[PDB]
Design a protein around this ligand. Sequence first.
Ligand SMILES: Nc1ncnc2c1ncn2[C@@H]1O[C@H](COP(=O)(O)OP(=O)(O)NP(=O)(O)O)[C@@H](O)[C@H]1O
Ligand SMILES: Nc1ncnc2c1ncn2[C@@H]1O[C@H](COP(=O)(O)OP(=O)(O)NP(=O)(O)O)[C@@H](O)[C@H]1O
Ligand SMILES: O=C1CCCN[C@@H]1CCCn1cnc2ccccc2c1=O
Ligand SMILES: O=C1CCCN[C@@H]1CCCn1cnc2ccccc2c1=O
Ligand SMILES: [Mg+2]
Ligand SMILES: [Mg+2]
Ligand SMILES: [Mg+2]
Lengths: 478, 486
Amino acid sequence: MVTAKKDENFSEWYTQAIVRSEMIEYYDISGCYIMRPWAFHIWEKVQRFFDDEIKKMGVENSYFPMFVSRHKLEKEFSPEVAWVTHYGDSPLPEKIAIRPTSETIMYPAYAKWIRSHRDLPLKLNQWCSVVRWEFKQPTPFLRTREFLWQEGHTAHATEEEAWELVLDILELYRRWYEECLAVPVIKGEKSEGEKFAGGKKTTTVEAFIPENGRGIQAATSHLLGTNFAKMFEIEFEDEEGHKRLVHQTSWGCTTRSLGVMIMTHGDDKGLVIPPRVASVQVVIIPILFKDGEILGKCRELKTMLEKADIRVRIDDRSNYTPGWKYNHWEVKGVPLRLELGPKDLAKGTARVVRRDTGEAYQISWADLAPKLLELMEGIQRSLFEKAKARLHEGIEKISTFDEVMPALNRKHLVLAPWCEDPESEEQIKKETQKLSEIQAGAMKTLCIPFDQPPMPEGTKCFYTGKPAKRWTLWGRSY
Amino acid sequence: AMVTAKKDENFSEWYTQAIVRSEMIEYYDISGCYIMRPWAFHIWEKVQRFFDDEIKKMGVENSYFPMFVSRHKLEKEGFSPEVAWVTHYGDSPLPEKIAIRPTSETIMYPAYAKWIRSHRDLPLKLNQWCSVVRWEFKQPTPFLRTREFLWQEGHTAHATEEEAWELVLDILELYRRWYEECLAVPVIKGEKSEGEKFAGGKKTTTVEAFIPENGRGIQAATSHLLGTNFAKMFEIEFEDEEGHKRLVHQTSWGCTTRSLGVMIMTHGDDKGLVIPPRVASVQVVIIPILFKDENTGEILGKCRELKTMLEKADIRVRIDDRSNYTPGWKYNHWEVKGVPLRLELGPKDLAKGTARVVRRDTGEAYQISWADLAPKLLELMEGIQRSLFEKAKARLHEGIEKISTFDEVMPALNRKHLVLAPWCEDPESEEQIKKETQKLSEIQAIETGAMKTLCIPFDQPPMPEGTKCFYTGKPAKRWTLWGRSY
Ligand SMILES: Nc1ncnc2c1ncn2[C@@H]1O[C@H](COP(=O)(O)OP(=O)(O)NP(=O)(O)O)[C@@H](O)[C@H]1O
Ligand SMILES: Nc1ncnc2c1ncn2[C@@H]1O[C@H](COP(=O)(O)OP(=O)(O)NP(=O)(O)O)[C@@H](O)[C@H]1O
Ligand SMILES: O=C1CCCN[C@@H]1CCCn1cnc2ccccc2c1=O
Ligand SMILES: O=C1CCCN[C@@H]1CCCn1cnc2ccccc2c1=O
Ligand SMILES: [Mg+2]
Ligand SMILES: [Mg+2]
Ligand SMILES: [Mg+2]
């Protein structure tokens, strides 16, 4: 049972929801959390979706070691890297690092495997864990010191083909968030301050948490250019015979995704899981009080529902009350609850409640599969749309710096015309830190959206005064 | 690039050649760690999906617990020298060092003690896929013994021993499948001796394999009946239906990337790898008989058509349309990699509406009409799969000598065979037999020699009454499988 109100104390709400749903268990090593099956099975679904998709692009999976030697890693962040120094009581000759990211592990093998134009495109992915000693406050899913991710890394003959892939991947991240988790996101380009300094252009998919006004990078996909190619000597021979540097990409997305889905659709009763990723779509609860028939129809219903590929549990555990079950599967966010007592049995009917609105329906045995399929689409589409609206009511389109803090104090992002000059962003981060401080924080660029509004002729940068270039989305962030 | 070392003559170099030249493994600067490229990784994905679908059917659920465990928690209760310790992040010293997981009992079991309070919480059945780090003292081998390796580990808790034991055996059966049905590697189910079992458990069942080229047995996977000692240690108790506090009955089980190695070694030959059709990335490689004399479109058009037609029958296909290599170059390339079937399509073939199919395991050739390709290739794949298994099974049973007396031991070892012997199962004798076989192996060493128990097989050959222990001379309980091992 959940008692903190999503709209009052958000961080306590979140903790209760992830704990009492049995998604997360607390752990003694700071920044690390145990992922219990209810949370893990959802990761399995997004993992499979993404994995299948990238496979259709010819990306292949691999596994590179979790250790990188010191001199390889330290060749061109630093404070977050975890170092192994001993085995038993014996010190290693040279300390070794646990993978924070894999560029320095993968790229020397690339330099080696890539020799001609015939060896391209090389497209590889891996699913693994990563360790970073995050200095910021940890949060289950969103920011953990060990997290699970995929990282994709690719090499191409031309910038054209690599950029095409950057976008294809970005679009798969939209789909992971938008089609699987029903979380709206905004495609965009990172400002030169926020991008991966190893690359030429970083693209992003960005999300928003209404309850605390924080934007959050949902995933990332980089046009690396050739900088890593010169650094690692990844070059090939073209059609002619001239040696050329490859054009690279990398891209990653994490268990952070689960966190965002939980915050987006969660309510005061706990989780709400979208049907496309719910391990249990429909839970069937037999009502039993004061004394056998019914258990038999329940089983028939499951088998019916499974021909529709509907994922179904029967909670027929006799050591729990029906009301306990109601509450349990509610807090866990099961999309549909199908009840069945004596009175229903004779009617040939079933009482079904949907988790997102609490609405109830009486539905005859014969109408279940198509009606539940109907209802499940509605829940999914409906969670997305209520979140898309929340997202858009959360962004304020604006023209001057004096608009900012009021918008930030309403826990909103702002969309603003900016000249995209280095200094401004840092000045904006600091002045906003200072105004937040004294109010007793900082606002950064989240992205430059692909979907640009029109920019009239003499429109000015909302902060410098210089002439604006494009519309940039700003806010407080994770 | 061909395989040059002969499998039977220069086994070690053969192994290194086959895994490298086939593009399965790339070498790496940290010892005992290896890169796994797609060609090997894909196989790990196949066995992982298989095993995973099966345990889910049994009510096991997946989870992810942290790779870190505190020193206090790991050291709660000769494993100690293998643990990797993190002492610093960036330039900053930790308050205490932290261990990278070598196995997950000391991370999972305190959580089990929390979650389990009542009979209604039972059974609890979890699994996790993850990597494990152990600073192995022995010489590293790609797949078979690595300092980082991938595995699943399963850990379950039950109200009764009976239900735990049942699970231990259902799991063990899934390990047999993993090897026999997926990788086509024969294995023997058995019970470890007192000396070889997990010391944390009451009984350890195992699935054992045999590598003929070096005569050494190798443990393939493991499944333990843990009893109640861990529940006692970690305080995993539940109130039963009458409110009495009972200890839970536990199991754990694991299988690793080792299994890919066992598969490579079992089916490989002098040309290189042979991959069973059930787990090969590519089952059929289509090779167009082109030189860069031309590309008129006629032959590739048809290769595309065929790919599609086979792809509809769930056959995994690749066209090697690379313009700078001869067909013969390409035959060898895909042989080294172990693609079970090679489809040849040349102008002659195009002229007749046929294609020529060659199977990697025997080299036999088949002329097949386009229309008959899908069903005929499926048939050939079942045949390949079955035949790889049958041949390995016979090499396994030809590698075991049933014996009666200790005098028969060293001759049986020198022929690179295992031995199956009546054994009293007293624990001092296992140690004594290890020592004696070590000393005798050194002495007849011309230039790991110890013979140990591998398992007491579930499949027991007959035991005529009054049979004596091959070593002690006391009455012999059962037959025990022994050998040199990894
Ligand atoms: N500690 C973490 N825990 C979980 N997810 C993370 C963590 N750090 C990053 N991510 C996610 O993984 C994606 C790719 O990682 P990466 O781009 O290396 O992150 P990053 O540059 O360190 N972001 P940030 O730490 O906020 O500056 C990020 O865009 C996040 O969505
Ligand atoms: N270093 C390794 N690399 C790959 N696979 C391994 C490794 N160590 C163990 N395995 C496999 O993992 C299975 C279960 O692990 P576990 O029972 O902990 O092994 P173990 O007791 O360390 N075996 P051993 O080291 O030979 O005494 C073993 O039965 C092996 O098949
Ligand atoms: O986005 C990704 C994900 C895919 C591959 N890597 C890129 C960028 C990684 C950026 N990054 C992020 N934190 C780090 C921490 C320590 C060392 C290095 C890094 C580091 O390189
Ligand atoms: O068999 C398995 C596989 C299933 C899960 N774990 C069990 C027991 C592993 C035994 N083991 C093996 N090497 C270790 C090394 C260091 C510390 C502890 C251990 C250790 O406990
Ligand atoms: Mg970071
Ligand atoms: Mg950053
Ligand atoms: Mg051992």
